[PDB]
Design a protein around this ligand. Sequence first.
Ligand SMILES: Cc1cc(C(=O)Nc2ccn(C)n2)on1
Ligand SMILES: [Cl-]
Ligand SMILES: [Mg+2]
Ligand SMILES: [Mg+2]
Ligand SMILES: [Mg+2]
Ligand SMILES: [Mg+2]
Lengths: 194, 194
Amino acid sequence: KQYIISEELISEGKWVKLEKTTYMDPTGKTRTWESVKRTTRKEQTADGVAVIPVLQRTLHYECIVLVKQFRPPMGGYCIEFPAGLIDDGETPEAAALRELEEETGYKGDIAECSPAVCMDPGLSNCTIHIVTVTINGDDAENARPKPKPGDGEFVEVISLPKNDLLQRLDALVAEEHLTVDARVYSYALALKHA
Amino acid sequence: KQYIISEELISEGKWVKLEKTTYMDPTGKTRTWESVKRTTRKQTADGVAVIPVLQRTLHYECIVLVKQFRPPMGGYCIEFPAGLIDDGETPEAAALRELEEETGYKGDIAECSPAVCMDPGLSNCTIHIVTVTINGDDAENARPKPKPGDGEFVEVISLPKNDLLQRLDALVAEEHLTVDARVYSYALALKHAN
Ligand SMILES: Cc1cc(C(=O)Nc2ccn(C)n2)on1
Ligand SMILES: [Cl-]
Ligand SMILES: [Mg+2]
Ligand SMILES: [Mg+2]
Ligand SMILES: [Mg+2]
Ligand SMILES: [Mg+2]
């Protein structure tokens, strides 16, 4: 029934643009919407990846590896899955493994890769693949992992046991000014609910 | 250590604005970021998203989701029921309200998250995730009445909780829909639990 009629550029930065979207509603009426897009998306199947990194070690409970960094749009520190945009010609899986190593120091093994999923679809066209990766924390490569932050990247690693993730996140929110990502929270909630 | 120095308005629409944020990086170097914000924030958060657990005796427990055309996406998306919080509305009340408007179901609040971020490298947008149970055996949830506001057009899709990820994957492959990242994250964790 519904579909896009036109997309008009309102304003274009280096990284983000705003568009006036005209679309057909299901009654047959023409309507508009204000849409955010990135300018960096080329032939990739999504803008980025987010990594669900399950750190596995003998005689340890599994941990979910998270990152904390200052996010200028939020004006503060956020706890998130490791994540980055996909380079031109790069696969989602390669992007995931690369960002996970850059942000955390860990070398993961691919487990699964989602289809492109939408970040905030009432506002933007932005999409990611969520890539689940296991980390063999008994491997010597993963013994004392050091982040390789890029230019302007400043990332702290937080590994939380999977079996208590929601409470551990809540404890972090209680003891500090910082925001948990909605995908991380959704993941922690389902772990409780299961 | 890092903080915001100033925010420059680039473009302001009715619903969304684009800003250039100046911030201090941890090395002491001043840097810029392009940031999106909504023009509607008042509240605890921009919006709510509802995790609606449909409980009917002798049936599988279902998660109730919604399918809508999303103009920024140019396509249809599957999401948790959700909307913006009305000025002077509590998150819990916004959750029950949106759930009724979008699905027709009348639910009970189980728990409510702190404000969590939507896409923190792009925007300041935040929501509360509100877990709600729905007694599907009550008369008020027999023939649920969806009350769409002006221009909203929503289809309701209930999927079994214990199979959610496989059911979503199927909807993507066969219906060319985009699943929301929070929904996908929830589904993954249901599989990853234990
Ligand atoms: C973001 C975002 C949300 C909307 C939206 O519903 N816009 C409407 C509805 C009625 N008018 C006059 N504009 O557009 N962009
Ligand atoms: Cl529940
Ligand atoms: Mg990153
Ligand atoms: Mg990165
Ligand atoms: Mg809605
Ligand atoms: Mg509504």
